[PDB]
Design a binder for this molecule. Structure first.
Ligand SMILES: [Mg+2]
Ligand SMILES: [Mg+2]
Ligand SMILES: [Mg+2]
Ligand SMILES: [Mg+2]
Ligand SMILES: [Mg+2]
Ligand SMILES: [Mg+2]
Ligand SMILES: [Mg+2]
Ligand SMILES: [Mg+2]
Ligand SMILES: [Mg+2]
Ligand SMILES: [Mg+2]
Ligand SMILES: [Mg+2]
Ligand SMILES: [Mg+2]
Ligand SMILES: [Mg+2]
Ligand SMILES: [Mg+2]
Ligand SMILES: [Mg+2]
Lengths: 53, 141, 69, 145, 107, 56, 56, 206, 61, 141, 63
RNA sequence: UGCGAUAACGAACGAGACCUUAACCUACUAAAUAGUGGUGCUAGCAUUUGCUGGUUAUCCACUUCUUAGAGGGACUAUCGGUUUCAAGCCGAUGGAAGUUUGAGGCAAUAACAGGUCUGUGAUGCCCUUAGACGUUCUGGGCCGCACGCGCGCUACACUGACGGAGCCAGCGAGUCUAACCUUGGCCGAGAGGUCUUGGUAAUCUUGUGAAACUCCGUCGUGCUGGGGAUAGAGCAUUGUAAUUAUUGCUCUUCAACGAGGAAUUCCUAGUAAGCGCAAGUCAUCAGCUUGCGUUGAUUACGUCCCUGCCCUUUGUACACACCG
């Protein structure tokens, strides 16, 4: 209440997190994805991204 | 209407669209005459279709070549291809076929890429290197 | 080592010895005669103005000259 | 706008602001040997001093040399616009000085001594002989400094 | 309302070219059997959305990269058409995987 | 909604992925097999393929 | 494990499939892990026909 | 020959090129007969070119580089030591000024001088390391004509590059001096000196 | 590296075995009738099979 | 015989128009000449320094002529260059935003360029007449 | 030294430990019908004329 | 891979076929989100028609160039040579293309005690669980330097530096689910500021007017005007916060480095290399990476000599398999 989230996290690594697992590092935020690069490889066919070349 | 053909030439990424219509001897590139093409040493590249068949083949036509893409050498190699293909297309469509055959002989006996685009394309870059074939330096120590 | 400013005897030596040079350039005037590249370029311009050397190419970074007649 | 020949009314190595400015080298780059005078400052001073930029610093006559010294020493008065100088807003009086030959060692030493005497961290790293601009000292500079 | 042409445009976007061309052929077939005047299916450059992620979850390995990619295929059709019977046929006949949007243009 | 078509189609793919994992976690005993999202005008239809459709 | 795996391999195989493969990896009361396979029929592993006909 | 007039006026000095195709606009490829035999069909003349830039394919098959013109291969060997990778426009400029200087000194044909330099610094017998190691016999092998013309171009351009490094003399005049000295046969040139060393080791190691 | 696999050579062999009162020494005619007498799943495979059939017919002649 | 500024080489025209502008003396050089570098990525001030503003202005006027409208940002990108960043690899830095802008007011005072209702500066009718006249003089000499 | 011009008639095959030598058979241009087998360093073809400082030496390094 | 030999014959996975991309298509369907030509209409400069500017129920026509659908095309075609007239290979001609047409994507059986419990609400077991190993906040550290090693950047210059001028790409990305890409005007030497504008994007940033490069000048073989490290003073931007300099800019300081012992990496054609740009992470920060184009070579079309791997034969007292 007093100082619990008193630090500004409007920007940086700690502002955002993966929507699947809440991981600040290794995230992709291209095209507004906000999934880490380890979960994007799992879900990438469900998103629509396919290995073509 | 006026007898006019429209051709194009290609180096790696440079496309030159020539508009060869019937005229009085005019040759222009992109707004400007063929005597100032920049670079100066590759002006004889764009003079090559002119000086191979003779300028009397060009004395009755107006060529206007709009060139985009590429670089300062690819654009020149596109200009000469556009001019040679434009003259060959004009002598196909309006002048005799036996005239086209002598012109095509004069171009392809000198350089095949006066009429046929160069099929060499940039190979993609792959990971672990800086180019298509070369890789990064490996250490062992 | 190189006379970068021109005295009268070096002027008289330029106007005497650049005739009978078959090929005259910046480096010829810096090597055979002992002036710098700056006076070599200035001397090349002055002597083709005066008409004792005639140009062949006259490019920047490479000036090629020949004797008159 | 035309080229011209010349003749050699010349004199060799000459002293200026306690610096042996060498002859046989064009005036802007001859004045660079003076500490606190670089290439921009030389070009601006030789432009403000009505000096021909072509004449080898030994072809230059002593009135022109005196004008060059005066513009270097008193640069605000000759419309050199004080973003161009060294000791802008100095440290201790607020003036805009350009610092010259033996004085740029003196002012650098004076400000290092100021940073040591205040006990600032940059002054302490200057005292120890390490890198003060936040570099990584793990790998580089691993012979001297 | 009384068969006044109102100049709509249908924008057709999809990641699947087969179903997108099915929709495009359906719209052009309807506009040709209705004798509508049209500027036809203009096919925009396909947006190749490439993501080059790292193939491994770790650091360990030969450094291998994956180019996952999604293609966006986009088309538009201009229809100078009546207001009711053409909004009916664009309300109906919606394919899954293809997003339509209809904008009326009076410019 | 005023987003670009790139981000809109990517976000619809993410919505498919989230819905698919939610039904994978929820409908485990109920024999789940897949989901298809049909975006009609004025409503969207979420179709669940499951063997025990009576349990769904 | 073998009972369940063969019980779905032959269920797929006489549900009308060209092939089936069940791989079970892990441990069972043992400090060492092994992967064992249960295959029946015709399978493919490389090419666009994997994206066509193989369901994983 | 007949001055044709067009709407955009082509100048007379480049209208003169309809009669005969010459390099840059000056030196003919006729009467550039290759004095040494066994190197024809490996020094390429008889298809004259205007400028020494021809973006063509020569390293896709084996002996296709013998169809590239000899001046163009000489330009291509000037694009080395890294900082000059690329810059064929620079290399063509260097070669153009080079043939200007070879026309000024020793008035006869610069293409003939370049061809004579090639045929005079091609190494006739080199060596090879026989056996599986450095510490073994070295045995003399005579050299194919394509490797002769290849090593001739490489030696001339490497001597030109090293003579032009760190001095007032430009690369065009150092290359022109290399080609003049090699064409007359001088041993004051790097290419003739290296050819003599390569032949002499093979003489001693037959 | 232009060696032809067994799915090219075997299919070409079977096509000559049952369609000799047919296909000739011309690749284009062989390519056009390989669309009708056989169901080859790709254009490249059809062209390879018809070209090997043409090679074997020219060899038989 | 209708000569535009496309039938004259760029170097020859820009030299002739700069000498004409300096000789006629109307272009009001800004007073921060000879103290200013022309770009952040530039290292030294221009070596002309009795002039060079006239040559920048002649090149800008020819640029405005051959395009349709060019503004200060396009001028900064055109005249900007590779910055030698010392120990780091080079990078394109746009040129001085004051010099090109003051060239544009300098030409707009003397009637060469115009306010261009789609953006930047067009070439005015008087400027087109002037540039064509120096283009004709540069050929006929 | 009277060097001899010799035309490659038959290209025998590539030897050397490194693989960089080609044994060829050469007919002498002057006084032909005189074939010797000779080693060649660089890339050699049929009909290739090459210079020899000995007319009497063979290639004894093969297979 | 196939031919062929043949106690084997006939098959399946892997290879190949397949898919994505690049290259050709004056053949098809077209387009004010691409372009061209006349001109409904104009309009400008120079002339006797060259160069442009501007409007699509405030024009018409066309698709060459551009885009993307459906197709066509190459199969080493044809002809020589060679091989056991076998698979094949080589040359020539034609061709957009004759290196699996270039490049990748997917990629079997068997493994490794390879890396990851620090990607996860993947997880067994163990440890801790309120003076916590949960979580948050404040400040510091991850940047600390006698030194050893690896990936790079910048260099040692004249095939160059500097200046002026010329002037050309392609792959991208971009905000109302809030401030992203920012054209234009004005101010500022510059970095930047400020007033507006277009853009949810083939529409606007953007012709990303990129850099290398080209031309003309200054330099002139001098650690120099190469190099730009170190260091001083000042001005800004991002940020709640810049000190241990975030980064940017201006002036100044101007170090080693004169082409690198022993050794060692990568590479066969639009490839090596030089060159910048976009994206990634990003509030700010690229000397990195992933891609993209610009300029574009030398050298081989081979061999087992070194290294590694595979196969056959052989030996074995090894099978935890020579680390036996
Ligand atoms: Mg590269
Ligand atoms: Mg398979
Ligand atoms: Mg495959
Ligand atoms: Mg602005
Ligand atoms: Mg057997
Ligand atoms: Mg088309
Ligand atoms: Mg382990
Ligand atoms: Mg981590
Ligand atoms: Mg903390
Ligand atoms: Mg660290
Ligand atoms: Mg420059
Ligand atoms: Mg573009
Ligand atoms: Mg940081
Ligand atoms: Mg970035
Ligand atoms: Mg990194």
């Amino acid at each position: 209440e007093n100082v619990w989230f008193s630090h500004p996290r409007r920007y940086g690594k700690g502002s955002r997190q993966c929507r699947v697992c809440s991981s600040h590092t290794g995230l992709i935020r291209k095209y507004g994805l906000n999934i880490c690069r380890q979960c994007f490889r799992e879900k990438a066919n469900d998103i629509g991204f396919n290995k073509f070349r | 209407a006026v007898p006019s053909v429209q051709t194009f030439g290609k180096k790696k990424s440079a496309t030159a669209v020539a508009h060869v219509k019937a005229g009085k001897g005019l040759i222009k590139v992109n707004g400007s005459p063929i005597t100032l093409v920049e670079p100066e040493i590759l002006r004889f590249k764009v003079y090559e279709p002119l000086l191979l068949v003779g300028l009397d083949k060009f004395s009755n036509i107006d060529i206007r070549v709009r060139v985009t893409g590429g670089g300062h050498v690819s654009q020149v190699y596109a200009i000469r291809q556009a001019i040679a293909k434009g003259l060959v297309a004009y002598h196909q469509k309006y002048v005799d076929e036996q005239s086209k055959n002598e012109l095509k002989k004069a171009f392809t006996s000198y350089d095949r890429t006066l009429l046929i685009a160069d099929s060499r394309r940039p190979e993609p870059k792959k990971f672990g290197g800086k180019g298509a074939r070369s890789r990064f330096q490996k250490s062992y120590r | 080592q190189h006379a970068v400013i021109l005295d009268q005897e070096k002027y008289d030596r330029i106007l005497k010895e650049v005739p009978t040079y078959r090929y005259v350039s910046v480096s010829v005037l810096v090597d055979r005669l002992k002036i710098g590249g700056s006076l070599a370029r200035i001397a090349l311009r002055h002597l083709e103005k005066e008409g004792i050397i005639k140009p062949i190419s006259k490019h920047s970074k490479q000036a090629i000259y020949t004797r008159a007649t | 706008s035309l080229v011209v020949q010349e003749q050699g009314s010349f004199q060799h190595i000459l002293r200026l602001l306690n610096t042996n400015v060498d002859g046989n080298i064009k005036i802007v780059y001859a004045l660079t040997t003076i500490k606190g005078v670089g290439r921009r400052y030389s070009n601006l001073v030789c432009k403000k001093a009505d000096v021909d930029l072509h004449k080898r610093a030994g072809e230059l006559t002593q009135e022109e040399l005196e004008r060059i010294v005066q513009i270097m020493q008193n640069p605000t008065h000759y419309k050199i616009p004080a973003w161009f100088l060294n000791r802008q807003n100095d440290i201790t009086d607020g003036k805009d000085y350009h610092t010259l030959a033996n004085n740029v060692e003196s002012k650098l030493r004076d400000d290092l001594e100021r940073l040591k005497k205040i006990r600032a961290h940059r002054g302490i790293r200057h005292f120890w002989g390490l890198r003060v601009r936040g570099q990584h000292t793990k790998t580089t500079g691993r012979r001297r400094a | 309302q009384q068969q006044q042409i109102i100049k709509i445009r249908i924008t057709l976007t999809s990641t699947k070219v087969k179903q997108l061309e099915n929709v495009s052929s359906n719209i052009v077939k309807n506009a040709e059997q209705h004798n509508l005047v049209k500027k036809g299916p203009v096919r925009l450059p396909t947006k190749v959305l490439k993501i080059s992620t790292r193939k491994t979850p770790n650091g360990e390995g030969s450094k291998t990269w994956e180019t996952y990619e999604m293609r966006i295929h986009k088309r538009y059709i201009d229809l100078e058409a009546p207001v009711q019977i053409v909004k009916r046929i664009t309300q109906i006949t919606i394919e899954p995987g293809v997003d339509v949007e209809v904008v009326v243009a009076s410019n | 909604a005023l987003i670009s078509k790139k981000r809109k189609l990517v976000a619809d793919g993410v919505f498919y992925a989230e819905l698919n994992e939610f039904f994978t976690r929820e409908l485990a005993e109920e024999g789940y097999s897949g989901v298809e999202v049909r975006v009609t005008p004025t409503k969207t239809e979420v179709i669940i393929r499951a063997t025990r459709t009576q349990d769904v | 494990i073998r009972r369940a795996a063969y019980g779905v391999v032959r269920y797929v195989m006489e549900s009308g499939a060209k092939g089936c493969e069940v791989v079970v990896s892990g441990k069972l009361r043992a400090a060492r892990a092994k992967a064992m396979k249960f295959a029946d029929g015709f399978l493919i592993h490389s090419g666009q026909p994997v994206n066509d006909f193989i369901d994983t | 020959f007949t001055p044709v007039v067009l709407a955009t006026p082509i100048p007379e000095e480049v209208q003169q090129a309809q009669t005969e195709i010459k390099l840059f606009n000056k030196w003919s490829f006729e009467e550039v007969e290759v004095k040494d035999a066994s190197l024809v069909d490996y020094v390429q003349v008889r298809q004259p070119i205007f400028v020494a830039h021809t973006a063509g394919r020569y390293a896709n098959k084996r002996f296709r580089k013998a169809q590239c013109p000899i001046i163009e291969r000489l330009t291509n060997s000037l694009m080395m030591n890294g900082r000059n990778n690329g810059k064929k426009l620079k290399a063509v400029r260097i070669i153009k000024h080079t043939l200007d200087i070879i026309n000024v000194l020793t008035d006869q044909n610069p293409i003939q001088v370049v061809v004579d330099a090639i045929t005079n610094t091609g190494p006739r017998e080199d060596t090879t390391r026989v056996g599986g190691g450095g510490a073994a016999r070295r045995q003399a092998v005579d050299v194919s004509p394509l490797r002769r013309v290849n090593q001739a171009i490489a030696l001339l351009t490497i001597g030109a590059r090293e003579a032009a490094f760190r001095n007032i003399k430009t690369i065009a005049e150092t290359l022109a001096e290399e080609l003049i000295n090699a064409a007359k046969g001088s041993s004051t040139s790097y290419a003739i000196k290296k050819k003599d060393e390569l032949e002499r080791v093979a003489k001693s190691n037959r | 590296g232009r060696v032809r696999t067994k799915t090219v050579k075997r299919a070409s062999k079977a096509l000559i075995e049952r369609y000799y009162p047919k296909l000739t020494l011309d690749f284009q005619t062989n390519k056009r009738l390989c669309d009708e007498i056989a169901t080859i799943q790709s254009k490249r495979l059809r062209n390879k099979i018809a070209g090997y059939t043409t090679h074997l017919m020219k060899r038989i002649q | 015989p209708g000569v535009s500024v496309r039938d004259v080489a760029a170097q020859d025209f820009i030299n002739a128009y700069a000498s004409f502008l300096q000789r006629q003396g109307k272009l009001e050089v800004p007073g921060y000449v000879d103290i200013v570098k022309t770009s952040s990525g530039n290292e030294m001030p221009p070596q002309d320094a009795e002039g060079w503003f006239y040559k920048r202005a002649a090149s800008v006027a020819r640029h405005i002529y051959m395009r349709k409208q060019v503004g200060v940002g396009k001028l900064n990108k055109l005249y900007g260059g590779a910055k030698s960043r010392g120990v780091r690899p080079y990078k394109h830095i746009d040129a001085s935003g004051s010099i090109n802008r003051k060239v544009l007011q300098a030409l707009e005072k003397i009637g060469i360029v115009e306010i261009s209702p789609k953006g930047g500066r067009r070439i005015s009718e008087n400027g087109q007449r002037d540039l064509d006249r120096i283009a004709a003089q540069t050929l006929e000499e | 030294t009277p060097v001899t011009l010799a035309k490659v008639i038959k290209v025998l095959g590539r030897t050397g430990s490194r693989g960089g030598v080609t044994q060829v058979r050469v007919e002498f241009l002057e006084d032909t019908s005189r074939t010797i087998v000779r080693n060649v360093k660089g890339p050699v073809r049929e009909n290739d004329i090459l210079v020899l400082m000995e007319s009497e030496r063979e290639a004894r390094r093969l297979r």
